[PDB]
Write an enzyme that holds these catalytic residues in place. Structure first.
Site, mmCIF file in Angstrom:
data_model
loop_
_atom_site.group_PDB
_atom_site.id
_atom_site.type_symbol
_atom_site.label_atom_id
_atom_site.label_comp_id
_atom_site.label_asym_id
_atom_site.label_seq_id
_atom_site.Cartn_x
_atom_site.Cartn_y
_atom_site.Cartn_z
ATOM 1 N N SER A 131 -45.216 33.123 -6.332
ATOM 2 C CA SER A 131 -45.574 31.715 -6.152
ATOM 3 C C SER A 131 -46.655 31.598 -5.078
ATOM 4 C CB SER A 131 -44.322 30.915 -5.760
ATOM 5 O OG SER A 131 -44.555 29.517 -5.811
ATOM 6 N N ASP A 148 -43.166 28.233 -17.324
ATOM 7 C CA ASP A 148 -43.705 27.760 -16.045
ATOM 8 C C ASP A 148 -44.794 26.705 -16.256
ATOM 9 O OD1 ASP A 148 -44.690 29.602 -13.019
ATOM 10 O OD2 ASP A 148 -44.832 27.459 -13.481
ATOM 11 N N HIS A 155 -40.950 28.131 -13.303
ATOM 12 C CA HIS A 155 -41.459 28.650 -12.037
ATOM 13 C C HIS A 155 -40.388 29.257 -11.132
ATOM 14 C CE1 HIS A 155 -44.654 29.258 -9.190
ATOM 15 N NE2 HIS A 155 -43.958 28.669 -8.233
#
EC number: 2.3.1.30
Lengths: 369, 368
Positions: free
Chosen positions: A149, A314, A347
């Site tokens: 991330s 995601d 995510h």
């Protein structure tokens, strides 16, 4: 307090002035870190882990701090990132509030918290501080740098600015820069905090602060981190089992509030704003005089091998962004393994679906060993 | 003004004592509506349109109000819903703030706005009020009832509670009940409003009020009404054109621009009531509850139906439209189910008339 430091934290002082990308410098600053596994004689089995926005340096449990880490299932003895093989170094990002100097930390010039006087934070600063930390630990070249991330951005910045520091790279749900949707999401999250009268222009200090805004910021985030279909599948229309106006009625609502509380209870609002802003401003291809934008920057990196993974669901950092990272690194000669993960966890998958993200990581590291 | 009523609005008064599903009743209440196209002598070409949460009765421009309608490209001479063929009746949902009685309306008992004293609103109430409106206009059987989004729920409730009132049905991105994701989103939207210090427990007065909260509610909605993918490929990372931690990207300015337009023409309390109603509705609870939602759908009396949905809709996923089609079909209705491949997500029925118009025009041509 405003700072939530793991009990087994160790620190590396950033010597004298630490210059920040967008201006100013930090004095008396430090980076909190933790290590897992033995560093070998040649010091060539070190693996740096750069975290997501909300993480800290306690990636996994240890005898001196048995509490589970944020990546407990990924890092440890016999796990995907096997500490029997690697010396894992995890650092709290500069600008955070889990030990590393951030807005909630004391400014030596005033004796008070920096608050909004903290210098604007850039992903490049996080990378530079991490690079210094590894070198301060006597490591001249990491076997691998891992980023997930926001950490994926920090890792790319480190590879571009300190090319000789890492032999390989594992990029999980990262990106060379934020796309409009994710920018809009973080914008609303920051809005929830700035719209809370409790923020007091960042001077909430020891008061309750913008707790309401923090809760919402976390809820909005959580809802965007996992697929809508998975949400419907996990909770359905089930009402709260606990059984006064317009309050929560559905289990999904109770679930969100429960986790939102934990975040609001362990994160500094100003630190959140700085980190969030940094994510929106980062652009790997933006400068340096090399040309080719992000793809060009990726091609100039010097990693020998790389593992790039992303979740098909995601929507914050879409799969295409991970593919872009893989393509750019490969264009520059790196031996890249790309793997799209068929997971409904979006995510958040690199954190909650290690059952799927773990094996490929283990496979890659087995080749690096 | 607390209410935002289109200038050409007409009204049907609801009977004193109109019963609300969750308790309480309405006195001196009314439903605002507008019509487009003429009703034939036999009164068999009427088409009722139930709107989405934010809509009003002004579906299209008219001589007495040339302002463009929310469905301008869909309703009109020679358009998908051809006014040359149908007498289109569009109603403002009960509980709204565009003419029909809601929180911003004056309570005849006090001479003051209802605010939070308005009875809790249910989709079934909206349906009952719409049914009364149609009958008050001397129409015993609609040629078709069209429902989109929230209106899709309202339309199903109408078909279940007043089965002899509609011959056919067009369901656009509707559902028999809301799924968790949409509930969470609406919960946050309501939270943005209630968290705004200007809300004052619903007793805000003239001037702004919880404006900032309303803006956030709309932004969150816009961010979910369309595909996240579509967003990224429309603004890029371009910064705002016009010169702490404030907005900087064009995508932010775009969201704020449209959000303000919404906040300027919608009552916060009305929004809360309508939003809550969407979460509470479950078609399965009706008619004894036999067979749950599928059972209720099968018991409906519509002869033909067109059911459409957007593949990228994450609020009312396509599976929910497939459910409506299957239930209606299992009950004998001749159903046409059409998944639309559009990136517009939930707002497709509003912004992608290019793909939604032809099917509607074809279906109604058959009903004609």
């Amino acid at each position: 307090m405003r700072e939530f430091i793991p009990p087994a934290s160790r620190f590396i002082e950033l010597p004298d002035g630490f210059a920040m990308r967008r201006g100013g410098a930090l004095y008396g600053a430090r980076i909190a870190y933790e290590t897992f596994g033995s560093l070998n004689a040649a010091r060539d089995n070190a693996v740096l882990v750069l975290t997501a926005l909300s993480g800290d340096a306690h990636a996994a449990s240890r005898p001196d701090d048995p509490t589970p880490g944020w990546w407990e299932a990924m890092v440890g003895p016999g796990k995907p990132v096997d500490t029997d093989l690697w010396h894992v170094i995890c650092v709290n990002s500069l600008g955070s509030c889990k030990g590393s100097t951030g807005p909630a930390s004391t400014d030596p010039r005033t004796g008070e918290p920096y608050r909004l006087s903290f210098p604007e934070l850039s992903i490049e600063d996080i990378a530079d501080a991490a690079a210094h930390t590894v070198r301060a630990l006597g490591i001249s070249r990491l076997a691998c740098v891992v980023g997930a991330s926001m950490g994926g951005m920090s890792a790319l910045a480190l590879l571009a600015r300190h090319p000789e520091l890492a032999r390989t790279h594992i990029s999980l749900s990262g990106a060379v820069h934020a796309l409009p949707f994710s920018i809009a999401v973080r914008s609303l999250q920051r809005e929830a905090i700035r719209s809370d009268p409790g923020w007091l222009q960042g001077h909430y200090d020891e008061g309750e602060g913008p707790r309401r805004g923090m809760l919402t910021a976390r809820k909005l985030g959580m809802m965007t981190y996992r697929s809508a279909q998975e949400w419907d599948c996990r909770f359905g229309r089930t009402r709260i089992g606990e059984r006064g106006r317009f309050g929560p009625e559905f289990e999904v609502e109770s679930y969100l509030d429960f986790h939102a509380q934990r975040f609001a209870d362990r994160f500094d609002p100003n630190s959140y704003l700085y980190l969030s802003h940094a994510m929106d401003q980062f652009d790997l291809g933006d400068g340096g005089g090399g040309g080719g934008g992000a793809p060009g920057a990726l091609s100039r990196m010097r990693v020998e091998r790389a593992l790039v993974m992303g979740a098909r669901t995601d929507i914050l950092f879409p799969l295409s962004q991970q593919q872009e990272i893989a393509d750019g690194l490969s264009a520059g000669g790196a031996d890249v393994s790309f793997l799209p993960v068929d997971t409904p966890a979006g995510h958040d998958a690199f954190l909650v679906d290690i059952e799927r993200f773990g094996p490929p990581v283990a496979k890659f590291l087995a080749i690096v060993a």
